[PDB]
Amino acid sequence: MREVISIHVGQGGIQVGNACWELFCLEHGIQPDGQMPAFNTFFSETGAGKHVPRAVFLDLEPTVIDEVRTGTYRQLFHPEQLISGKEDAANNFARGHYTIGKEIVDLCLDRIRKLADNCTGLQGFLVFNSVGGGTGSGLGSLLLERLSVDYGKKSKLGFTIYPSPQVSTAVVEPYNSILSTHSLLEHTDVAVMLDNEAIYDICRRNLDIERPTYTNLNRLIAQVISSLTASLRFDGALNVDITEFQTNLVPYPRIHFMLSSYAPIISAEKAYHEQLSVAEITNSAFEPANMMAKCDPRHGKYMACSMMYRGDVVPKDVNASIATIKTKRTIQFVDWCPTGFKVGINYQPPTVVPGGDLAKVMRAVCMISNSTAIAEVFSRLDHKFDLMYAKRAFVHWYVGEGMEEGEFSEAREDLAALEKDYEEVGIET
Amino acid sequence: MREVISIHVGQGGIQVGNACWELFCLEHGIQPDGQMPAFNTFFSETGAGKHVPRAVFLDLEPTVIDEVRTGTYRQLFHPEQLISGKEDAANNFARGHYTIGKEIVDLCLDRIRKLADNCTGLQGFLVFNSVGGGTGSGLGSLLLERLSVDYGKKSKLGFTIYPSPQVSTAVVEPYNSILSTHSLLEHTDVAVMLDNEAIYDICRRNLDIERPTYTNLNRLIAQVISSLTASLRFDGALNVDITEFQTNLVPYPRIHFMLSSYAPIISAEKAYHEQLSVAEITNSAFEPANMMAKCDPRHGKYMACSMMYRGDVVPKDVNASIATIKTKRTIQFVDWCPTGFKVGINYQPPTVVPGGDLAKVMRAVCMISNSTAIAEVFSRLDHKFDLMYAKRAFVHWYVGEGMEEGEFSEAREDLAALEKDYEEVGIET
Amino acid sequence: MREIVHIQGGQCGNQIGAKFWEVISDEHGIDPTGTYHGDSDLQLERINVYYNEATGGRYVPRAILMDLEPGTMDSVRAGPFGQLFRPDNFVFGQTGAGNNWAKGHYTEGAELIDSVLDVVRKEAEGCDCLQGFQITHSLGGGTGSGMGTLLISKVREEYPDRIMETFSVVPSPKVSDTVVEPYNATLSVHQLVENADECMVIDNEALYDICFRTLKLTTPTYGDLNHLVSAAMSGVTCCLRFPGQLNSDLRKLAVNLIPFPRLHFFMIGFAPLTSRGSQQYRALTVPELTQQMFDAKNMMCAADPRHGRYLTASALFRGRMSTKEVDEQMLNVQNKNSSYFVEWIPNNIKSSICDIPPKGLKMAVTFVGNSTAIQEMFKRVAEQFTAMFRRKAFLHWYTGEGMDEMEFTEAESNMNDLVSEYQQYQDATA
Amino acid sequence: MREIVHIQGGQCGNQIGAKFWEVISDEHGIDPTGTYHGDSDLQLERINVYYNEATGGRYVPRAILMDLEPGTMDSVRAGPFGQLFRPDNFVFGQTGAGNNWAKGHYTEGAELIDSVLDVVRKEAEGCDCLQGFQITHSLGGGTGSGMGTLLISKVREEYPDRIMETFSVVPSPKVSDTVVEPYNATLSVHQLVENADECMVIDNEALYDICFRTLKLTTPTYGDLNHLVSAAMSGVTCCLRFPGQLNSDLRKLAVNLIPFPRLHFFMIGFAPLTSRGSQQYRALTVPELTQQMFDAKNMMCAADPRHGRYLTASALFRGRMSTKEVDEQMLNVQNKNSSYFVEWIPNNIKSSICDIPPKGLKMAVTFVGNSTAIQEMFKRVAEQFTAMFRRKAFLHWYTGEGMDEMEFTEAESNMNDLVSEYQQYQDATA
C-alpha cells in the first residue's frame, strides 16, 4: 500500500535502470530468475510463484533493450513492458518528440494505466533519462506532458544525465538539452543533476579504480536511488515519504533543480584503515569535490539539504555533528531559510552488489541538496547554445520534422528567466 | 583526548619519519602488520581490527615514498595519506614553494582537515623537514603558512636538519636554507636544530660504531622524539604538556631556536662496565661534545633547559644533582632568567628498537636547551650566503620560477635582525 | 473511575505512544499478551483508568492510533507490546500527509476525521466518568500536527466539560530535522492555543543534552529519548492512579497552574536520572532529588529558566517519604530562589505526594513548571517563520491545497500576541 | 557537623589529594571500596565531617577534582583508593593550561569555573553546618594556580562567613623545576592575600632535606613527600574529628593565630619522624617530641626561623598524655627561647590536645607556626620575579591571552607591601 512506478526511457536511462534493478533484486534477494527463495514498492507478486517489476522500458533503438531481452534478466521483466521502436531518435528533439513519439505515447500510456490500476497506494513516479540523446529527451518530455495532464496531483521525479561541462560525447546535445528543460521545467517536481564528469573524477579519487567504465557509474547511481527509497522499502527510525520532498526542497515551484551526493564510497584496502565516524562521513558529504554533479557549491549559497542516513546511527550525536558542519564557515544558507537541514534515518545498512568495486560499510549518508551554485550550469550551457543558434547550425535537422523553427528562441528566453530567479533568490533581504 | 599530528615533508623528514614510526609502533607493540595483539596520541583505531597512524607523508619524488609503499610497513599507513608528486623540487626554493606546491597544498590541507576533525584534544603539530632540499624547504614553508592562517592558536614544532658547518652534501643549500628560515621564523613556535655533523661525531665516540650510516642517525632522532612525547603517551610523576613548551622555552617570541641533547647513548660492552648514576647521566647531558647540534654551548649563555627524565628517577636526588651542575662554573645563564631549569619525569624506561645499536638502559635524560651559542650558526651560515649572492651565483635558477629576485636580500636582512636580538639578549642589565 | 483515552498521531507520536504503553504495562504488571503478572492489588483496583477488561479476562488499552501512512501500523504491531492494542482502533490512510500541514488538516486528514471521531465517540460513550483526554504528537509532522489539531478542535467542540492535554514535542530549534518546520509549528500553535488546557513542550535538544551529559550515555537512540518522555508521562498522573497521602488528579493541576485561560504551556522535568557508573554512590533522598530537579538542564525544554521566572511550579512526588521534609525543602528552595518565582503570586509552588514509586526506584519526582521562559522558544520559532515567510519560501505547497495566506498572517499575529502576553505578565509587579 | 569540602587543582594538588584521602580512609578505617572496617565507634560518629553516606551503605568523600588535562583523571582512578570519589565530581578539560597562568585563569579555566561552581554549590547546599573549605594546589602550575585562585575568589565572594584554607606548595626556590615559575607564583600570591584565611606554604627543598637527613631514606619518591604532607594535613584537624581533653577546630586556629587580616601565611611541622634503623631506640614521649618539633629543619619551609621570630605558634597534640607535662614543657620552651618569640604578644604559644593518636603511633604533634621568617621566602621569590620581569622574559606568553602588564606591576607592589608588613611588625617592640 505504498509503491512507485519507475519509467526508464532512453539509452542512459535504461542502462542505469538495468543496474538499479540489479541492485533492487539483490537487496531483497529476489533471484534474477524471478522467484524469491516488503517488495510491494517495486516488485508485484503474480498471485503465485514469481514477481514482476514495476517498470516500463521505453526505447526505440532495439539494441540495448534487446540485449536486456537476452541478458541475465531475460525471465524477470514482463514480456510486454519492454517497448522497442523501429528506428532511432538521432539526437534531434523534433524526431523523438513530434514524429516517432506520436506513435509510442499511446502504448506507453496504456501500459502505465494497466500498472497503476494494479496498486493501492501509489506515491510518485521515477523517470530516468539522458538529455543529450534524442529519445531520452523527446520521449521523456512527451511522457511527462501526458502523465501530468492525465494524473494531476501525483509527484514526478527525474534523474537527468546532463551534459558535462568540459568532457563531451555529442555535439548537438546542447540543443536537445535546452528544449528538454523547457518541458521538464514544468511537469516534474524534482530534477536531480547527475553528471558524468564528477562521477568519473570520484571513481578516480575515492574508489581508486583507474579506468572507470559505465558499469561502475551506473552502479553508484543505483546506490543513490536505493538509499533514497530505503525509507519506503525498509524499516527506519525517521521515515520520510517520497511526497514530503515536494514540500521540503522545492521553495519556489519553478526552482527545483537539486544536486546529490553520496558517502562513503571507499575500496577495501583503505576501508579497513579508516573508522568512518558519523562526523567524518557527514563531513565528506558536504565536501565540494565529491558532489555528484560538476559544481563547486562554495560558489553560491545552499537552500535546502535532505540528508538520509542508513545503518547504525546515533541520533543526538548526528545532531551534534550537523551543528558542527553548520559552524563550518564556507557553507552558508540564504537569508530566508533558517531551518537548514532536514534529516532522515533508516536501519537497513548499505547493501553491496556482489562483484562491485564498492565495499560493504555500515553507515551511509545520501544528501540531496538544493543550492544556488547549480545555476551556473544552465548559464554555461546557454553559452554553447548561443554559439550555435546565432549561425543556425544544425537547425534544419530540427525544422525537418515539422517542429516550428522559432521555438528555440522561446525556450531559450524561458531558460534565461531561470537566472531571473537564481542569481535573484540568492540576494539577501 | 590528547593527540598530535605528525607531518613528514621532504626526503630527510620522511626518512626520520620512517624510523620514528618504527619506534612508535614498537614501544606500543603495534605490529607492523597494523594489528595490536594509550595510542590515541598517534595511532587511531578504525572501529575494529587495525590502527592507522596520524601522519601525512608529503613528498614529490616518488622514490622514497614508493619504497615505503613497498617496505615492511606497506599495510600500516592509510593508502591515501602518502602523497606523491610528479617531479622534483631540485633544491631551489622557488620551485617547491611557487610552482609545484601551489598544486599539492590543497590536497595536503584537505587531508589535514580530515584528520583533525577525527580527534577531540589536538594539542600541537609536529612537522619534520630538511632545509637544504627543495621540497623540505618550499613545501614546508608553504604548509606552515597555510596551517597558521587556518588554525591559529595551536602550537607548531619543527625538526629542521640544518646544514652542518663543515661537512656538506649540497651546494645551493645555503640559499634555500635562509628563505626557509624567513618563513619558519614566524609560523612555528619551536625549531630544534638537529645537525648531521654532531650526530656522526657522537656515533663515532659513544656507540663506537665506526662507519655510521643514515639509519643509525634517524634511530637516534626517533629516540629523542619519543623521549619528548613520553609525557603525553605514558604515565609519569611530573607530566609536561606539549603546550607548556611555548610558555617555558620561548622568551621573546622571535628567538625560538633550541638545540637538543640525549643521554645515555652507550653500546653494551662499555654499558655493563658503567653504573650511569643520575648525577653522571645529567652531567653527560650538559657536556658540549654530545650536543645534538654542532655548537660549543660554552661560547655563550644558556636561557632555558627543559630536562625530561624517563625511567627510575629519585626526584629530590635529581634536584641535588641539578644543583651541583648549577655549581659547574662553565655553564652560566643570562641575568634575566634565575629560574634556570624546568624538569619532567616519566616512568616508562627507554624502549629499545630490536637490532639497533643502542643498548637498553634504565634511565634517560633528554634535554632541550635554548641558549645563545646557537646564534653563531646563523652568522656562519650567512657568511656562505654572502659569498654567493654578491656574485648572483645560481640566482637565475630561482628567478626562473617567477619568485621575485630581491626577496633574498629582504630575507637576509630579516635574518640579520636575528643577531640584533641574540648577541643583544645575552647582554647583562 | 476517571477514564482517560490516549490518542496518537504521526510517526513520532506513535513511537512515543508505544513506549508509554509498554512502560505503563510494565508498571501495572501486564505482560505483552494482556494478563496480570504482578503481586499487589493496587495495580488492579485502578486498572480501569487506562485499560478495559477485554472479553475473556484479557486487558486492552483504551488508546487510538492514527496516521496517513500505513508503515507505523506494522511498525507498532511488530514492535514489543503490540498485541495489546485492539484491531479496531487502528484507523489509517494510504496517501500520507507527507510533511505538509494543509494536507493533513484540509485535504486528506479531513477525509478520516469523521471515522476517527466515530471511534472516539464509541470509546467515550462507553466510559462512565471521563476525566479527559491526552494526546501525543509532533508539531512538525504533517500527519502529526494536522490530524492532531483537527481532532482537538473536534473533540473540544464535543466535550467542553473535560480537559485536553497534549504531550507535544515541538521542533528543537537548533538540532532541526526538516526545513519546512516553522510553518507547521506556527499553524499548530495557533490551534492549540484555542482548544487545549495543558500543552507541555518537549524539544530534542534538551533530551540529547540530558542523555548526553547526565546519564552519560554513548549513542542516544530515539527509543531512549522516547523512553524518557514515557517515564515523565507516567509520573504525571501516577499520583492519581494509586493512593497517596496527598492525592492529586488532572484537574487539580489544571486549576493550580494556569492563571490565565491561555497561559497553558508547561515544561516537564524528571528526577532522578543518573549514569550507571555513578549509580552506586549517590543517595535516593529528597535533598538530592530537589537539587537535581530544579536544575536548568534537567528539563525537557531548551529554555534556561534563569532567562525568566516561574509563574507556577507543581511537583508530584512518588514513593514514601516524610512529607514534612518535602515541604520544608520546598519552603527553603522558594525562599532561596526568591527571584525566580514571580512575586505577585504567593507560595506559587505546589506539591503532591503519592505512595507507590515506579518499577525500580524508591523515590521519583515529576516537576511541571508553567514558566515565563518558553516565551523565548516561541519568539525564536517566530523568527524562523518570519524569515521563511516574507520571501514566501515553500509557500506554494501550502497555497495549493486550499489554505490561504490569511491563515498564516493571523496565526503569526496570534503567536506574537501569546508571547506578548507572557512578557506582559512577567513584567507587571505588585 | 562542621563539614569540610576538599578541592584539588593541578597535578601536584591532585597527587597530594589522593594521598591525603587514602591516609584519611586508612585512619577512619575505610577500605578502598567504601565500607567500614575498623573496630571502635569514634571513627563513625564523626564520619560526616569528611565523607557522605552513599546510597546503599557506602561512603564517598566530599571532595572535588579539577584539571585542564584529563591525564590526572585516569591517574587517580587507576591509583589506589580511587573507587571512592564519585563519578560526578570529576570535572575536567582537554586543552590543558600548560603551565601558563593567564590560560588557567582568563582563557580556559574561565570556561569551566561555572561548572565547578555549580558542583561546589550542589555540595555546599546539601550540608547543614559548613565549617569551611580547604584547598590543595601547586602555585607554579598553570592549572593549579589559575583554577585555584579563580575558584577561591568565586567561593569567597560566595561564602564570606566560612573560612578558606589552602595547603599550597610554593616553588622551592633552589631546587626549581620550571623556569616560568616566579610569574605564576606572584600572580597567585596576589590573589591568596585577598580571599584566604590560612595559607601554609610547603617547599620541596625542606621536604627533600627531611626525607634525606631525618628519615634517612635513600630514594625520595614524590609519593613519599606527598605522604608526609598528607600526614600533616590529617593532623591539622584530627583534633576536631575526635574527642579531646582540650578540643579545637578550624576557627579557633583562625583566631588564635593571625593578628592582622593578611598576616596569614603559616609554616607546618610534623613530629615525630625517625628512620627505621633508629626506630627501636628513642622514646615516644613529649620531651623528645618537643625537642624534635621546634627544630629549624623539622619544618616544611626553607626558612631557618633563627633568621626571624614567631608571631604565634600553635601545637596540636594527639594521643593521650598528662596535659600538665605538655604545658610545663611549653612554658619552659618559651622561657628558654624567649628571643624567638616576639615580646609584644604575651604567651604567644597555644596548645590543643586530642585523644586518639594516628594509625601506628602513640603520640603525634602538628606544629603550625605563623612566623615572620617566611617573609624572606617571599623576598627571594620577588628577586626572581624582578630579574625575570625588567627584561620582559617570557612576557608575551602572558600578554597574548589578554592579561596586561598592569596586573604584574600592581601584584609585585602588593607582594612588596606584604613583606614590608611582615618586617614592620617584626621591628615594632613594646
Ligand SMILES: Nc1nc2c(ncn2[C@@H]2O[C@H](COP(=O)(O)OP(=O)(O)OP(=O)(O)O)[C@@H](O)[C@H]2O)c(=O)[nH]1
Ligand atoms: N551516467 C550514465 N550515462 C550514460 C549511460 N549510457 C549513456 N549515457 C549517456 O547518454 C548520453 C547520450 O544520449 P543518449 O540518451 O544515450 O542517446 P539515445 O538514447 O540513443 O537517443 P537516440 O539514440 O537518438 O535514440 C551520453 O551523455 C551518455 O554518457 C550510462 O550507462 N550511465
Ligand SMILES: Nc1nc2c(ncn2[C@@H]2O[C@H](COP(=O)(O)OP(=O)(O)OP(=O)(O)O)[C@@H](O)[C@H]2O)c(=O)[nH]1
Ligand atoms: N638526519 C638525517 N638527514 C637526512 C636524511 N636523509 C637526507 N637527509 C638530509 O637532507 C638534506 C638534503 O635535502 P633533502 O630534503 O634530502 O632534498 P629533497 O627532499 O630531495 O628535495 P628535492 O629533492 O628537490 O625534492 C641533506 O642534508 C641530507 O643529509 C636522514 O635520513 N637523516
Ligand SMILES: Nc1nc2c(ncn2[C@@H]2O[C@H](COP(=O)(O)OP(=O)(O)O)[C@@H](O)[C@H]2O)c(=O)[nH]1
Ligand atoms: N523525541 C523523538 N522525536 C521523533 C522521533 N521520531 C520522529 N521524531 C520527530 O518527528 C518529526 C517529524 O514528524 P513526523 O511524525 O515524522 O511526520 P508526520 O507523518 O506528518 O506526522 C520530526 O521532528 C522527527 O524528528 C523519536 O523517535 N523520538
Ligand SMILES: Nc1nc2c(ncn2[C@@H]2O[C@H](COP(=O)(O)OP(=O)(O)O)[C@@H](O)[C@H]2O)c(=O)[nH]1
Ligand atoms: N611535593 C610534590 N610536588 C609535586 C608533585 N608533582 C608535581 N609537583 C609540582 O607541581 C609543580 C607543577 O605544577 P603542575 O600541577 O604540574 O602544573 P598544572 O597542570 O598547570 O597545575 C611543579 O612544581 C611540580 O614539581 C609531587 O608529587 N609531590
